[PDB]
UniProtKB/Swiss-Prot annotation:
It comes from Escherichia coli. This is Cyclic GMP-AMP synthase. Mg(2+) binds at D128, D130, D190. ATP binds at R179, S219. Belongs to the CD-NTase family. A01 subfamily.
Length: 370
């Protein structure tokens, strides 16, 4: 049978090389992130100035709106400009004091932070940067002091101003963040908005929600970051590799949608924690993962953040048809890895395993007899 260890891990031409970004590419994403950060800083500063002038100069609501229409708030729709005008006009002294005193902070969460960001594969897919905006403020036991709509409209202001001023830059509203899509760079940047104490305890990291009936959700991304980094320590460095590969498999099977990265990561560490394996043997390890992955999602995948009320993926008895489509797709993986392994020719093995991870590795000479 064929060994795929070099298919997976060979420098420059192996799968990890096709997935992982170079320093040049990473620096590009950082530069793109910096553009969004600086603009959001500007927007917050512009808003803060008007927030100052409100109580300072006893402004009318109209005077507030007209000032905001000299800033980046210009690019919101009329109702949104009026709404932000009202919010800044009528924010309480305590909330106003916080807003004026503190600048927003920026910290990246997700795969760009714990190094699992893959290159995109299908034409529509994009590299994903999760850069959160954090506002220091009084955070009571019940909720943050500053209204969630205000902060969300300031994020929208930033991204919509970037959209309006740049071609290829398109704003998209998600449930948990504002997203700016940069077509020319095959990159989009997710901007979740957070409220945090100004005095960071994870029990006070509040995420501002954009859809539904709940305004805030206590969700510290640091918890997932800490959990995954500790998992890499516990299981071994090959965890990032096998997580990258599974995400690559997901990107190959789904142009859009499919199981989330977090659920994939959690399922993999659950397997690798439970089952004895050889980290150095990526061929066997990936085969182990593929075999057991559907049963993990059948068992249900609980969030590594215990504060979450719902699991990342329900138990089988709670699976809807969309869940089943995912699991049945997962069941297909193990068969692909074994057919490749038992392919009669070397070029046949490559084409077969590339049905799982997509045509990225093209060098059949990486495949060696076991
Ligand atoms: N608690 C919790 N946190 C989530 C969930 N989904 C995303 N997050 C937070 O958002 C961060 C980024 O999420 P994703 O963009 O979907 O995954 P990723 O790690 O960045 O991988 P990818 O390259 O595919 O973007 C990681 C995690 O802290 C979730 O369902 N529950
Ligand atoms: N902190 C935190 N961020 C999340 C969570 N879920 C999603 N996000 C942010 O939203 C981004 C994509 O959101 P989706 O909507 O799931 O697409 C990725 C991540 O940065 C979460 O549960 N907690
Ligand atoms: Mg991400
Ligand atoms: Mg994202």
């Amino acid at each position: 049978p064929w060994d795929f260890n070099n298919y997976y891990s060979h420098n420059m031409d192996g799968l990890i090389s096709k997935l992982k970004l170079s320093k040049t590419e990473s620096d590009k994403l950082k530069a793109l992130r910096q553009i969004v950060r600086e603009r959001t800083r500007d927007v917050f500063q512009e808003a803060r100035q008007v927030a100052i002038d409100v109580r300072r100069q006893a402004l009318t609501l109209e005077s507030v709106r007209l000032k905001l229409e000299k800033t980046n708030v210009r690019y919101l729709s009329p109702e949104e400009r009026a709404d932000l005008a009202r919010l800044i006009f009528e924010m309480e002294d305590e909330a106003r004091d916080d807003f004026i005193k503190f600048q927003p902070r920026f910290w990246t969460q997700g795969s760009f932070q714990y190094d699992t960001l893959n290159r995109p594969f299908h034409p529509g897919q994009e590299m994903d940067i999760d850069d959160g905006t954090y506002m220091p403020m009084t955070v009571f036991e019940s909720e943050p002091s500053i209204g969630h709509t205000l902060l969300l409209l300031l994020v929208d202001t930033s991204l919509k101003s970037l959209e309006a001023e740049n071609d290829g830059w398109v704003f998209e509203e998600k449930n948990t963040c504002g997203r700016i899509k940069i077509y020319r760079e095959k990159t989009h940047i997710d901007v979740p908005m957070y409220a945090i104490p100004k005095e960071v305890e994870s029990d006070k990291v509040n995420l501002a929600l954009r859809e539904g009936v709940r305004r805030w959700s206590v969700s510290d991304p640091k918890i997932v970051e800490d959990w995954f980094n500790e998992s890499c320590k516990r299981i071994g460095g090959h965890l990032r590799s096998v997580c990258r590969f599974m995400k690559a498999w997901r990107d190959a099977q789904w142009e859009v949608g499919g199981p989330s990265s977090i659920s994939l990561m959690t399922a993999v560490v659950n397997i690798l924690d439970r089952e004895s394996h050889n980290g150095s043997d990526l061929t066997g390890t990936m085969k182990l993962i593929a075999r057991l992955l559907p049963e993990e999602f059948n068992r249900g995948v609980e969030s590594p953040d215990d504060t979450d009320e719902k699991p990342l993926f329900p138990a089988e008895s709670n699976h809807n048809v969309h869940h089943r489509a995912i699991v049945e797709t997962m069941e297909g993986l193990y068969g692909i890895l074994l057919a490749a392994e038992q392919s009669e020719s070397r070029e046949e093995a490559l084409r077969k395993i590339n049905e799982a991870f997509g045509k990225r590795v093209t060098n059949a000479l990486l495949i060696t007899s076991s």
